[PDB]
């Protein structure tokens, strides 16, 4: 009930999980956090500039928090408030930045509360090396510094004690400042005393008593972490070199085994190149990995001079020796190890980001719906003749002739093949009989090896020479790679459509569907189904959650750009269940709407079907106004929502120069005439439309004017690509 009958859409609620909406004051903080954490290591969103990008992100976050906007809903419906088509990852990136800012703010508030409580406890205890509750404010203010803030908080907890009932060397702050500035402003304990005298005032009789305390203070100091942070993570020439056993076990398969003596790989090769990071992670798993910056030998020398006394005559020499010992102890405790851990974390993050980017690129390349319809647009669509043969060696090859309306019309088998060692006529006769049995619109043959390609070519030649494409014309059998149809044949949809059929028929049906409506097949699959297709080997090393989220966002954006047919998902099972990746219409909401439509028998009468029938809430309708499309009002099956219906009608009337009288349906010259083709484009001016929107409407229509004109001129525009014929390398 909360997912389907909720005030806000499902996408908006899912995006802002940690942060339930954005407040007026919190919007600026979220935008600043997103801008700061938008592209630190690599260049991303530098398109939108720094200040402009930050302003756009803040506007998108505010819109999402107020109107329950989503990724596509804010990228398209809020083109002005956000980057106007700056990049595809606009809404998703803004949502991620807002969530990160909210999480950082919550963590900072918790840290500040903990610091205040600790300070109050210390004041109550000691007020009746001190313990002052001054770092709580710094920790609470340090929202951007997540890892550094956590390290500082942990160091403070371990230094003050952490107990909850109910003069040795330089000071930590001075040492941290001298190390950060590069110049040792404060030296060690410039006193005549030496470690001999300091080791008697604890009860150990050892000169290393104060060294442990100094090391603990240095390790648990936020200033030290900040100074060390970014020094090696920014640049680290990781030298890849196989070990004695890694040289033979890797066999040049991983990053630490391909180059026997190829070292000095900077951070750009691991972060920017996700393949190198994945290889290093895989090699460092079992056998070994070669990950060493080799730049400290000189970064750790400069710190040695700082914090140590300069004179050497007993007191000065003793103080300098003690400072050097304390610095060495601190470095061994949390100096090299902390830097190595930070570098490893940065490398892992870079590898994960590269894997996610590769997966997103693969999803964008393979998800674009580019079917091969009749004439590359008698009857709606074309009859795709899905030919998914098994071997083509005297075995029954599936050959189904499905229609262009997301359904299979018929099919047949072809056991005869060029089986028989010398039989060049049986296959031709079988192909001719199959072609004469039905009247397909196109041929969709598969391929596995040289024999499969030869069989497909022979079938195409026989069809073209005897006009077997339609019985009265030659039909070109379009080549289709056996990539999507094989997976779709043995899916839930394939099993439900046909249960008592061989796998060849299912493969042929899947191939025919993949070359008729890729969007329908993508929306009618579990997303499990998407995870089956591997986007790249480096994605396995990185977390699959990021890849899945990127794929879901890409699918949602594609669905929003191409739209969804309301009547298509009412009676046709092939084009059903396509309301799961809509902007603002989540999976639960889509399922509830489909169930309501199946029960009440309500059709896609107009854009307000879910607002008038009481099926969808006002926020859901507003967020999903630009994605729901119907067969028939005039502006229902398009991106024009109810708010912009009057503006679209007025613009169409002005462009067509027709009469103005409550035009919603009755005047058709401005609606039908403009929908048929461009009637008058100079009549509708951008400045006039923007002024009208600002004076009446409460919003500028400078960016939305083009979208409204396109929706009024072309309804149900598809955002998928065109039919991509197989190439030489692609075919192979």
């Amino acid at each position: 009930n909360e997912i389907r009958a909720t005030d806000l859409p499902e996408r908006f609620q899912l995006r802002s999980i940690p942060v339930k909406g954005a407040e007026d004051d919190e919007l600026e903080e979220e935008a600043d956090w997103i801008y700061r954490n938008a592209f630190a290591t690599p260049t991303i969103s530098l398109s939108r500039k720094g200040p402009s990008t930050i302003q756009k992100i803040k506007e998108a976050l505010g819109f999402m928090r107020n109107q329950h906007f989503e990724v596509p809903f804010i990228a398209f419906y809020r083109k002005e408030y956000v980057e106007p088509e700056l990049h595809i990852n606009d809404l998703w990136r803004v949502w991620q930045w807002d969530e990160k800012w909210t999480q950082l703010r919550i963590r900072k508030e918790n840290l500040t509360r903990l610091f205040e409580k600790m300070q109050a406890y210390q004041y109550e205890q000691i007020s009746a090396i001190r313990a002052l509750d001054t770092t709580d404010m710094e920790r609470l203010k340090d929202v951007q510094s997540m890892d550094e803030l956590k390290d500082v908080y942990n160091h403070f907890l371990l230094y003050y004690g952490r107990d909850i009932p109910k003069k040795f060397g330089l000071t930590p702050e001075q040492f941290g400042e001298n190390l950060r500035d590069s110049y040792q402003r404060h030296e060690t304990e410039q006193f005549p005393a030496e470690p001999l005298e300091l080791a008697k005032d604890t009860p150990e009789a050892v000169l290393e008593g104060a060294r442990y305390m100094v090391a603990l203070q240095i390790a648990r100091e936020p200033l030290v972490r900040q100074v060390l942070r970014q020094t090696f993570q920014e640049r680290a020439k990781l030298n890849i070199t196989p070990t004695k056993k890694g040289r033979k076990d890797v066999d040049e398969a991983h990053y630490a085994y391909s180059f026997k003596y190829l070292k000095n790989k900077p951070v750009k090769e691991l972060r920017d190149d996700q393949f190198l990071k994945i290889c290093l992670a895989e090699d460092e798993g079992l056998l070994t990995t070669d990950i060493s910056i080799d730049l400290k030998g000189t970064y750790f020398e400069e710190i040695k001079q700082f914090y140590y006394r300069d004179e050497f005559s007993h007191q000065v020499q003793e103080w300098n020796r003690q400072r050097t010992m304390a610095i060495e102890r601190a470095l061994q405790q949390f100096l090299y190890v902390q830097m190595a851990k930070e570098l490893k974390n940065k490398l892992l993050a870079e590898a994960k980001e590269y894997v996610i980017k590769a997966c997103s690129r693969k999803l964008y390349n393979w998800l674009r719906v580019a079917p091969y319809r009749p004439d590359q647009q008698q009857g709606k669509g074309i009859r795709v003749l899905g030919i998914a043969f098994s071997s083509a060696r005297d075995h029954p090859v599936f050959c189904a002739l499905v229609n262009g309306e997301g359904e299979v019309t018929d099919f047949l088998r072809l056991p005869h093949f060029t089986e028989e060692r010398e039989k060049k006529a049986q296959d031709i006769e079988t192909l001719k009989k199959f072609l004469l049995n039905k009247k397909p619109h196109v041929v969709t043959v598969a391929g596995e090896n040289r024999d499969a390609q030869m069989l497909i070519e022979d079938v195409k030649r026989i069809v073209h020479e005897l006009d077997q494409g339609q019985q009265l014309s030659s039909i070109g059998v379009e080549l289709v790679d056996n990539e999507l149809a094989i997976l779709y044949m043995n899916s839930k949809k394939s099993e439900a459509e046909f249960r008592d059929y061989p796998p060849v028929l299912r493969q042929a049906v899947s191939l025919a569907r993949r070359i008729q409506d890729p969007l329908i097949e993508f929306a009618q699959v579990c997303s499990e189904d998407i995870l089956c297709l591997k986007f790249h080997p480096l994605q396995e090393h990185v977390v699959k959650e990021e890849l899945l989220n990127a794929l879901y966002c890409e699918f949602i954006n594609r669905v929003n750009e191409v739209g969804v047919d309301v009547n298509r998902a009412i009676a046709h099972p092939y084009s059903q269940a396509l309301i799961q990746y809509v902007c603002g219409l989540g999976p639960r909401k889509g399922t509830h709407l489909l169930k309501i439509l199946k029960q009440n028998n309500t059709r896609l009468e107009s854009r307000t079907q879910l607002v008038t029938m009481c099926h969808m809430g006002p926020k859901v309708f507003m967020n999903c106004a630009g994605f729901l499309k119907i067969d028939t009002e005039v502006l229902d099956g398009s991106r024009v929502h109810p708010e912009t219906y009057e503006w679209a009608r007025k613009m169409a009337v002005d462009a067509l120069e027709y009469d103005e009288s409550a035009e919603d349906a009755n005047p058709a010259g401005a609606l039908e005439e403009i929908l048929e083709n461009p009637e008058r484009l100079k009549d509708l001016d951008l400045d006039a439309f923007a002024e009208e929107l600002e004076r009446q409407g409460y919003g500028d229509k400078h960016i939305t004017l083009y979208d409204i004109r396109a929706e009024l001129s072309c309804r149900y525009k598809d955002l998928r690509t065109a039919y991509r014929s197989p190439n030489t390398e692609e075919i192979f």
Binding site: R113, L114, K117, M118, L157, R162, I164
Partner: protein
């Protein structure tokens, strides 16, 4: 808990192993037979330190195999109920905590944990903190526990921990 006791065992030696390296072969076979295994009587065995003596090989009638009842001085790890040890947390999940008592892995549920240690699913690393956020428990931390139960899954010990007694956390 690790202990050092004297155990006994016999291994059949195929006649092909006869020769100047008979004792060496018997020792080698003993090493790769009673290391890492587990039994319900003495518990989980870690490794063997030294061997006391080699018994007299009684050749079986009608069979070339000869058995050597060797008595080896090896160590053993047989945790009991009520003992308190110091382990390290391996993973933190809402269902429960996972640790690693050397060759054995225990598990503590949220019910055993007091109500003060809440969940932190929002943060990337699964961790449990209090309202004031003073004490923090995460993975790779030397956290103590109490063995309130034992189990042997066919030579695979898997005990169960608890976190009700006071003074169980960071030392």
């Amino acid at each position: 808990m690790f202990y050092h006791i004297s155990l006994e065992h016999e291994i059949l030696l195929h006649p092909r192993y006869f020769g100047p390296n008979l004792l060496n072969t018997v020792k080698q076979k003993l090493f790769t037979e009673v290391e890492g295994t587990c039994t319900g009587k003495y518990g989980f065995v870690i490794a063997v330190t030294t061997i006391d003596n080699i018994g007299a090989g009684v050749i079986q009638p009608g069979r070339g195999f000869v058995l050597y009842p060797v008595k080896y001085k090896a160590i053993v790890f047989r945790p009991f109920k009520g003992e308190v040890v110091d382990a390290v947390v391996t993973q933190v999940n809402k269902v429960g905590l996972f640790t690693e008592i050397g060759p054995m892995s225990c598990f503590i549920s949220r019910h055993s944990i007091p109500s003060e240690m809440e969940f932190d699913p929002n943060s990337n690393p699964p961790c449990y903190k209090t309202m004031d956020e003073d004490i923090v428990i995460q993975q790779d931390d030397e956290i103590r526990l109490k063995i309130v139960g034992t189990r042997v899954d066919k030579n695979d010990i898997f005990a169960i921990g608890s976190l009700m007694d006071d003074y169980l956390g960071l030392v």
